[PDB]
């Protein structure tokens, strides 16, 4: 039920291989480790979760922007993009987010879906 | 070779049913008919064209946003957004095009790859 | 003067200086005729394109050079040009702000309107 | 001032005013400091953050309250905020405007960074 996808502006080309960390906030506001990943050769990460351990709560999706553009030998802007969002309180529902990025810029929307 | 996905950024959807038109410059410096068609209910527009057909040449990506925005009862700014860029020219070579769509904004990306 | 436009660099961060910016009116034959035209100043904005007396209602579209903007750069980018076209309204309000964001895969563009 | 934050609507073509911005400077123990806040004016900007003396080489974060400014609009929103995090760097030019553009699923953030 949650799927990023990261795209690069000045490539154009799937962001390969940028780490993706997920949080969760707990009971005492802090914010737990949930899932984390790296996007494929598509720009895809899958598999972050199940449907039954993605429960109710504040998640922050943290798309390591900068440690990509390192990689690639680039001094970017950002430390890193986040996304706050609360999830499922209605229900399960499907999420994918999708980042674009460029080395001062970044773009991000959500993709939300009722199986 | 060619595929355009729309996405809306109110909805947090697929924008759907968004017709698109492709033109290709021609020799007299004109626009001359390519291709259309509508995004599907996974806001992808797939089958265009194929490799035969999409020779080299300067391509207008022409996707209808205020027909969309229209078709929902929304008052948009824009008349459509078009993305022209010269395609094939070393070769044959795979293109989507993404857009994000707001009443009063738009962006748009290009994923190119090669087969 | 009702109408500025606003050119950003995603890439490195900054304006987008010396961008040439066209823009013209659709004419009652659908044609379009040129209108105004400069290039954008040190901070990537270009004023005093017109004046309320010229800017009438109708269909208006900015034509930004973007791909001369790259290659001025070393930077070999995906679009021919970026186009944001959009209606003139006395209805709404009476000042026109057309932003873009560039990146040479991509690019972003917002409407500021404003009294 | 060396750091603005503007703040822009995209569903409404409009500044985004009266919104929360809070910035936090990073402390030596990685727990986020109260730097700065204001609210965004009548134009969506927020000058007079801080000063030149203030404003030390570090890592600060720039929180957005996106989820009251929709909600007072009565739009529901995706996000709990927006954040944009960031190093500022001597090496590099002196003034750094942060700008965002909000949709309610999405928004784009780019650093506008000059001497
Ligand atoms: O499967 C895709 C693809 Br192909 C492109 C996108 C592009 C997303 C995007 C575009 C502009 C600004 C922010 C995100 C999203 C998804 Br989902
Ligand atoms: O005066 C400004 C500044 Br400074 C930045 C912007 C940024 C616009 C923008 C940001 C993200 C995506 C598209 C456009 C717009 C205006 Br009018």
Known sequence: PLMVKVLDA???????NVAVHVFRKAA????????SGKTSESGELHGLTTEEEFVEGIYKVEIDTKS????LGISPFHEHAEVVFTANDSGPRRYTIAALLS???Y??????TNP
Chains 1, 2 share one sequence.
């Open 10 to 16: 000045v490539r154009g080309s799937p962001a390969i």
């Open 28 to 35: 005492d506001d802090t914010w737990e480790p949930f899932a």
């Open 68 to 71: 990509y553009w390192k990689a």
């Open 103 to 105: 080395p001062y810029s």
């Open 107 to 112: 773009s991000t929307t959500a993709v939300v």
